[PDB]
């Protein structure tokens, strides 16, 4: 389930996922949809750092922009994280199978 | 809560693909550092370093079998963070799917 | 669906600058084409096309006074179109807030 | 009544003056749409959509709404509102000098 292709494909992913600040920024945008004027506001953290974390966030699929006429705002999107945790559940299910096998086999008589 | 720091130390340590390399030789057999470095181009002294981070978030634990150290992957943290993924998700999915009905339903 | 086509008529009817002054003036008080013309910046030719389209949409209508005809502005026929405007604009201000209250703070 | 009010709602009573931009506005009063549903919808060709939309938004009578690939088109009621309240003014004020110039006629000797 690790294969290189899956760290490949969920690397921008963790890499997003990696850093607290970013973690405040998709708990408030999960919350309600915001500026990047409200998030400036509400964190210390600069304009210029949010619109980095946004455009990071944005390219790995973790926040769409949404744009009602001229008003820019941003959401988070659960669909990135319900693909990473299947994939972390796969894994931790191969294993569990794995150390299985090794628990019953020191058993074998 | 610690969450999001627990969270943010997880992912820190999947992040790094010299990390992946290493539980994905976990993944399939628990191995001493010694393996490890004779596995993968990466010297004794950085598998110790990244066997820590992997350690200090909970992936990988290390265990004391006759003469030598092995290392083995832990699932349990993969669930757990996979569980608080599916929660997090779960919301913001119900949020979105408010959202497209009350401003698109046809 | 009726109401369309005559919502349609109505602003067709208000779009244009000089049927504006013309029915304005009528708001004001009825008269005939003639004092139309007398009392106001336009050709009598203008003065003919406009009521007769201001006639046609049912903002005005002619009434014989006399040895006259006069022009009437039908007071009823703006009622009867903000109160149209007043319905559909509540029906498109609930679906904003509707939409509004799950995606923003409020 | 003045001619201030017509200068300012001119371009609402232009694209108020379409029976067409009525169907329009009547589906995106609705539901939020593209430019492609409202084709599905409506027998009135993609740049009659396409021409009819630029209109509505010039004058406030539609906003768009981007969210990804999508674009979508919203109808306010905010002009409808204001047109409502100005006609509803003038009639009014019709009804009022009607009521004036009759005791007027009913004083003259």
Known sequence: GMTVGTYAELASVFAALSDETRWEILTELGRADQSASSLATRLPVS?????????????????????????????????????????????????????????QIAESM
């Open 47 to 103: 304009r210029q750092a949010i619109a980095k974390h946004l455009n990071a966030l944005q390219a790995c699929g973790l926040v769409e922009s949404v744009k009602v006429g001229r008003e820019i705002r941003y959401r988070a999107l659960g669909a990135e994280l319900n693909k990473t945790a299947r994939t972390l559940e796969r894994i931790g299910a191969e294993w569990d199978r794995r150390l299985a096998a090794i628990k």
